[PDB]
Tab-separated table of C-alpha atoms in Angstrom:
chain	number	residue	atom	x	y	z
A	1	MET	CA	70.211	56.857	9.600
A	2	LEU	CA	67.107	56.125	7.545
A	3	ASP	CA	65.540	59.374	6.336
A	4	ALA	CA	62.296	60.477	7.959
A	5	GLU	CA	60.525	60.625	4.572
A	6	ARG	CA	60.585	56.829	4.482
A	7	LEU	CA	58.941	56.381	7.883
A	8	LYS	CA	55.531	58.040	7.296
A	9	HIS	CA	53.836	54.647	7.161
A	10	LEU	CA	54.972	53.956	10.718
A	11	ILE	CA	52.664	56.548	12.335
A	12	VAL	CA	49.905	54.018	12.981
A	13	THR	CA	46.582	54.343	14.820
A	14	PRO	CA	46.289	51.365	17.245
A	15	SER	CA	43.058	49.351	17.326
A	16	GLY	CA	41.924	45.845	18.134
A	17	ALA	CA	42.310	43.667	21.200
A	18	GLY	CA	45.190	42.672	23.507
A	19	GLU	CA	47.555	41.602	20.735
A	20	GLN	CA	46.256	43.584	17.719
A	21	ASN	CA	46.405	46.855	19.690
A	22	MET	CA	50.103	46.191	20.431
A	23	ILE	CA	50.809	45.354	16.785
A	24	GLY	CA	49.483	48.818	16.023
A	25	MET	CA	51.141	50.606	18.928
A	26	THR	CA	54.593	49.258	18.027
A	27	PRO	CA	55.452	51.211	14.845
A	28	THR	CA	54.276	54.539	16.259
A	29	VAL	CA	56.226	54.254	19.500
A	30	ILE	CA	59.434	53.191	17.752
A	31	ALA	CA	59.073	55.752	14.944
A	32	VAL	CA	58.737	58.620	17.464
A	33	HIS	CA	61.627	57.171	19.501
A	34	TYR	CA	63.797	56.974	16.371
A	35	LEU	CA	62.837	60.428	15.019
A	36	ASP	CA	63.528	61.983	18.419
A	37	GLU	CA	66.991	60.474	18.807
A	38	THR	CA	68.075	61.084	15.228
A	39	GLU	CA	66.674	64.645	15.545
A	40	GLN	CA	64.700	64.346	12.297
A	41	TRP	CA	61.461	66.026	13.325
A	42	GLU	CA	62.033	69.068	11.113
A	43	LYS	CA	62.635	66.919	8.016
A	44	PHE	CA	59.660	64.721	8.894
A	45	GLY	CA	57.214	67.467	9.747
A	46	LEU	CA	57.201	68.635	13.382
A	47	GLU	CA	53.452	69.243	13.115
A	48	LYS	CA	53.041	65.455	12.877
A	49	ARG	CA	54.489	64.661	16.309
A	50	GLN	CA	51.611	65.759	18.567
A	51	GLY	CA	49.218	63.487	16.743
A	52	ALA	CA	51.781	60.696	16.954
A	53	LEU	CA	52.011	61.095	20.752
A	54	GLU	CA	48.234	60.989	20.940
A	55	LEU	CA	48.167	57.775	18.917
A	56	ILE	CA	50.758	56.345	21.331
A	57	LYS	CA	48.585	57.394	24.293
A	58	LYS	CA	45.663	55.824	22.463
A	59	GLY	CA	47.618	52.556	22.288
A	60	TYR	CA	48.599	52.634	25.959
A	61	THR	CA	45.076	53.419	27.193
A	62	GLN	CA	43.538	50.757	24.938
A	63	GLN	CA	46.068	48.195	26.174
A	64	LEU	CA	45.042	48.815	29.788
A	65	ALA	CA	41.598	47.438	28.910
A	66	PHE	CA	43.233	44.034	28.585
A	67	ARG	CA	45.309	44.242	31.774
A	68	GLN	CA	44.070	41.366	33.901
A	69	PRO	CA	43.716	41.485	37.733
A	70	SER	CA	47.060	39.655	37.881
A	71	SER	CA	48.673	42.583	36.018
A	72	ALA	CA	49.238	40.144	33.125
A	73	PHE	CA	48.010	40.588	29.559
A	74	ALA	CA	46.142	38.425	27.067
A	75	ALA	CA	44.343	39.101	23.779
A	76	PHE	CA	40.970	38.944	25.575
A	77	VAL	CA	40.064	39.287	29.264
A	78	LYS	CA	38.773	35.716	29.435
A	79	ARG	CA	41.870	34.256	27.748
A	80	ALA	CA	44.713	32.788	29.870
A	81	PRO	CA	47.564	35.342	30.109
A	82	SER	CA	50.549	35.123	27.793
A	83	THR	CA	54.100	35.289	29.138
A	84	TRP	CA	55.407	36.615	25.805
A	85	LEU	CA	52.692	39.276	25.382
A	86	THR	CA	53.096	40.469	28.957
A	87	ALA	CA	56.868	40.763	28.494
A	88	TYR	CA	56.320	42.594	25.149
A	89	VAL	CA	53.988	45.083	26.812
A	90	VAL	CA	56.793	45.689	29.296
A	91	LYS	CA	59.320	46.046	26.461
A	92	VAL	CA	57.253	48.684	24.637
A	93	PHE	CA	55.987	50.544	27.720
A	94	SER	CA	59.514	50.795	29.194
A	95	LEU	CA	60.752	52.397	25.984
A	96	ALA	CA	57.834	54.810	25.790
A	97	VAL	CA	58.260	56.179	29.338
A	98	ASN	CA	59.521	59.530	28.076
A	99	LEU	CA	56.889	59.801	25.380
A	100	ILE	CA	53.788	59.454	27.537
A	101	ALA	CA	52.804	58.798	31.159
A	102	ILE	CA	53.265	55.089	31.854
A	103	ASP	CA	51.817	54.063	35.225
A	104	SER	CA	54.612	52.350	37.196
A	105	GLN	CA	51.997	50.121	38.869
A	106	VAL	CA	51.050	48.718	35.467
A	107	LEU	CA	54.653	48.316	34.284
A	108	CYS	CA	56.039	46.864	37.492
A	109	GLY	CA	52.860	44.879	38.053
A	110	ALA	CA	53.545	43.004	34.803
A	111	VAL	CA	57.230	42.574	35.692
A	112	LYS	CA	56.228	41.124	39.082
A	113	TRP	CA	53.775	38.669	37.513
A	114	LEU	CA	56.378	37.295	35.094
A	115	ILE	CA	58.930	36.708	37.855
A	116	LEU	CA	56.644	35.214	40.507
A	117	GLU	CA	54.472	33.194	38.120
A	118	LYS	CA	56.351	32.282	34.937
A	119	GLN	CA	59.981	31.732	35.901
A	120	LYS	CA	61.093	28.187	36.701
A	121	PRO	CA	63.661	27.344	39.450
A	122	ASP	CA	66.354	27.012	36.770
A	123	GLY	CA	65.629	30.589	35.647
A	124	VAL	CA	63.652	29.637	32.522
A	125	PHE	CA	60.604	31.655	31.514
A	126	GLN	CA	57.722	29.483	30.321
A	127	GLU	CA	54.709	30.350	28.155
A	128	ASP	CA	51.421	28.690	29.125
A	129	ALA	CA	49.126	30.567	26.728
A	130	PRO	CA	50.754	31.359	23.355
A	131	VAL	CA	49.581	34.453	21.509
A	132	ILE	CA	46.988	34.016	18.770
A	133	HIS	CA	48.962	36.401	16.532
A	134	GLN	CA	52.022	34.240	15.972
A	135	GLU	CA	53.271	36.646	13.291
A	136	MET	CA	53.888	39.333	15.956
A	137	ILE	CA	56.589	37.370	17.801
A	138	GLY	CA	59.210	37.385	15.066
A	139	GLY	CA	61.980	34.800	15.236
A	140	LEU	CA	60.472	33.247	18.320
A	141	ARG	CA	57.832	31.666	16.064
A	142	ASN	CA	60.441	29.120	14.953
A	143	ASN	CA	60.092	26.468	17.707
A	144	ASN	CA	63.814	25.669	17.735
A	145	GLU	CA	65.615	26.624	20.960
A	146	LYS	CA	62.454	28.033	22.547
A	147	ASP	CA	63.563	27.939	26.192
A	148	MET	CA	66.633	30.018	25.367
A	149	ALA	CA	64.905	32.423	22.972
A	150	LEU	CA	61.954	33.107	25.273
A	151	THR	CA	64.073	33.443	28.441
A	152	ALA	CA	66.340	35.866	26.592
A	153	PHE	CA	63.282	37.813	25.318
A	154	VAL	CA	61.661	38.139	28.752
A	155	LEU	CA	65.020	38.818	30.379
A	156	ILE	CA	65.543	41.751	27.989
A	157	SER	CA	62.191	43.223	29.012
A	158	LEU	CA	62.956	42.857	32.737
A	159	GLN	CA	66.338	44.498	32.300
A	160	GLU	CA	64.808	47.470	30.467
A	161	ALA	CA	62.349	47.911	33.370
A	162	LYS	CA	64.888	47.280	36.154
A	163	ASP	CA	65.593	50.909	37.174
A	164	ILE	CA	61.896	51.807	37.208
A	165	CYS	CA	60.820	48.631	38.976
A	166	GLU	CA	63.745	47.750	41.265
A	167	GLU	CA	62.338	49.253	44.452
A	168	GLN	CA	58.769	48.183	43.694
A	169	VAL	CA	59.818	44.622	42.730
A	170	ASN	CA	62.491	43.269	45.112
A	171	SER	CA	62.721	39.851	43.439
A	172	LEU	CA	63.877	41.541	40.222
A	173	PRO	CA	67.698	41.332	40.588
A	174	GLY	CA	67.501	37.679	41.566
A	175	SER	CA	65.224	36.940	38.627
A	176	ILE	CA	67.671	38.559	36.226
A	177	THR	CA	70.626	36.626	37.638
A	178	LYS	CA	68.768	33.289	37.430
A	179	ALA	CA	67.683	33.754	33.808
A	180	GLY	CA	71.224	34.916	33.051
A	181	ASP	CA	72.502	31.723	34.689
A	182	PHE	CA	70.293	29.632	32.409
A	183	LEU	CA	71.423	31.467	29.280
A	184	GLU	CA	75.121	31.372	30.166
A	185	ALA	CA	75.010	27.648	30.928
A	186	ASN	CA	73.496	26.675	27.550
A	187	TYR	CA	74.856	29.433	25.287
A	188	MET	CA	77.607	27.277	23.764
A	189	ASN	CA	74.967	24.823	22.551
A	190	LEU	CA	72.948	27.255	20.435
A	191	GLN	CA	72.887	26.570	16.697
A	192	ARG	CA	70.566	29.413	15.544
A	193	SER	CA	72.088	32.812	14.817
A	194	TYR	CA	68.776	34.297	16.043
A	195	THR	CA	69.104	32.748	19.519
A	196	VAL	CA	72.824	33.548	19.605
A	197	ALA	CA	71.921	37.220	18.937
A	198	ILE	CA	68.951	37.620	21.288
A	199	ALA	CA	70.599	35.663	24.158
A	200	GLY	CA	73.881	37.407	23.390
A	201	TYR	CA	72.130	40.726	24.016
A	202	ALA	CA	70.472	39.567	27.243
A	203	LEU	CA	73.869	38.317	28.512
A	204	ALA	CA	75.807	41.419	27.428
A	205	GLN	CA	73.221	43.513	29.340
A	206	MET	CA	74.545	41.762	32.501
A	207	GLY	CA	78.177	41.938	31.403
A	208	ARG	CA	78.111	38.154	31.240
A	209	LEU	CA	78.918	37.725	27.544
A	210	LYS	CA	82.630	37.009	27.785
A	211	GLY	CA	85.381	34.650	26.732
A	212	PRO	CA	84.173	31.643	24.739
A	213	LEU	CA	80.548	32.822	24.737
A	214	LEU	CA	81.566	36.223	23.385
A	215	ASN	CA	83.721	34.484	20.830
A	216	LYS	CA	80.769	32.347	19.706
A	217	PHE	CA	78.584	35.476	19.470
A	218	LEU	CA	81.083	37.306	17.266
A	219	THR	CA	82.052	34.444	14.992
A	220	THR	CA	78.403	33.503	14.357
A	221	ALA	CA	78.188	36.705	12.297
A	222	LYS	CA	78.341	35.947	8.600
A	223	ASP	CA	81.037	38.151	7.021
A	224	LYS	CA	81.246	40.068	10.310
A	225	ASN	CA	78.131	42.026	9.324
A	226	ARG	CA	74.977	40.070	10.094
A	227	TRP	CA	73.421	37.283	12.079
A	228	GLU	CA	71.264	35.121	9.825
A	229	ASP	CA	69.572	31.725	9.633
A	230	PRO	CA	68.305	29.743	6.610
A	231	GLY	CA	64.760	31.108	6.803
A	232	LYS	CA	62.692	34.288	6.768
A	233	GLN	CA	64.780	37.378	6.054
A	234	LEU	CA	62.623	39.243	8.604
A	235	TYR	CA	63.986	37.034	11.389
A	236	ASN	CA	67.526	37.850	10.213
A	237	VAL	CA	66.854	41.590	10.294
A	238	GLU	CA	65.511	41.204	13.831
A	239	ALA	CA	68.473	38.975	14.898
A	240	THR	CA	71.000	41.408	13.467
A	241	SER	CA	69.276	44.234	15.333
A	242	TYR	CA	69.601	42.371	18.647
A	243	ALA	CA	73.249	41.718	17.778
A	244	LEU	CA	73.887	45.427	17.136
A	245	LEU	CA	72.388	46.291	20.537
A	246	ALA	CA	74.709	43.654	22.088
A	247	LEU	CA	77.743	45.168	20.362
A	248	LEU	CA	76.851	48.632	21.697
A	249	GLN	CA	76.378	47.127	25.171
A	250	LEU	CA	79.837	45.559	24.760
A	251	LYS	CA	81.077	48.906	23.444
A	252	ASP	CA	82.736	46.922	20.646
A	253	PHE	CA	82.540	49.908	18.296
A	254	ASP	CA	85.118	48.448	15.923
A	255	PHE	CA	82.751	45.611	14.943
A	256	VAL	CA	79.709	47.920	14.652
A	257	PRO	CA	80.073	49.790	11.275
A	258	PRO	CA	79.827	46.685	9.044
A	259	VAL	CA	76.676	45.656	10.914
A	260	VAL	CA	74.979	49.058	10.662
A	261	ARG	CA	75.955	49.200	6.993
A	262	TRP	CA	74.269	45.832	6.373
A	263	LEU	CA	71.185	46.951	8.324
A	264	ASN	CA	71.005	50.171	6.307
A	265	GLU	CA	71.390	48.351	2.986
A	266	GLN	CA	68.457	46.128	3.823
A	267	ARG	CA	66.466	49.315	3.231
A	268	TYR	CA	63.836	47.946	5.580
A	269	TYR	CA	61.537	50.659	6.883
A	270	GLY	CA	59.249	48.473	8.956
A	271	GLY	CA	55.527	47.893	8.719
A	272	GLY	CA	53.671	45.089	7.007
A	273	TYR	CA	52.402	41.654	7.924
A	274	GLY	CA	54.387	40.000	10.718
A	275	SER	CA	56.672	43.023	11.026
A	276	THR	CA	56.193	43.805	14.737
A	277	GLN	CA	59.540	42.491	16.027
A	278	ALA	CA	61.662	43.542	13.042
A	279	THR	CA	60.148	47.052	13.134
A	280	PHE	CA	60.604	47.565	16.875
A	281	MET	CA	64.051	46.005	16.881
A	282	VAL	CA	65.574	47.649	13.825
A	283	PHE	CA	64.551	51.111	14.949
A	284	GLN	CA	65.472	50.514	18.610
A	285	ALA	CA	68.881	49.251	17.497
A	286	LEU	CA	69.575	52.108	15.048
A	287	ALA	CA	68.377	54.753	17.510
A	288	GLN	CA	70.721	53.194	20.090
A	289	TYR	CA	73.546	53.322	17.546
A	290	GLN	CA	72.921	57.052	17.103
A	291	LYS	CA	72.989	57.535	20.864
A	292	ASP	CA	76.064	55.443	21.703
A	293	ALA	CA	78.386	54.992	18.717
A	294	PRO	CA	81.298	57.505	18.608
């Protein structure tokens, strides 16, 4: 439970286009989410929350300016829509539903577009127009195991928006099962701890991380406390956060403490260049820990 005093830098005013606006919206949404769940508003300064909610609304409203007729999103209205960005918008908006008024049409419109336009017959989600801001995609920037990493990423967004979009988007359940099929079928082949963690989470969300796959997920953890790859530490923080969420989904509370301890000791408080995924993920994971861990 990172103390509120350390998170002041996360109350960010969003500005910029389709990607930049989201880079700015991210810390504010997750900071409010985290402060709410850990009940730290009094030790943060309750008089700071209303402005934070306004900044979040500011981010949402600004983002809508880049919502294309297809309900997809891109950095600029004339740029081909990005599968990743659209899925990220869904990821953030779904989590901010209780913070501000998110128009279901917008949310579910994006979900629908991803399913009907970017999912292959084998369940794979494909990206036809990569984001300009490659630093905002975290561990996905490493081109290794892209099909798995991206499908897991998009699948996680769809699952978070399932309840809200189920009736409005009938092809949702099928989409989720297909992507899950793809992940399950190739899970034993993954070499990256990042992919093992992100896909492990997507699978656990469906209750499909079992037996050998579950065993691979657990044993991939170095010293039973983190999921890491020989690269940027930021990617490892993000991977370990996805892994923690998977553990909570699995309700494997025995394995959890070492992981949260490692995450805490990183003393990472988000923010900074290329911090979008690590910031959203670490605070989503820790807030979820507060909510679910006995």
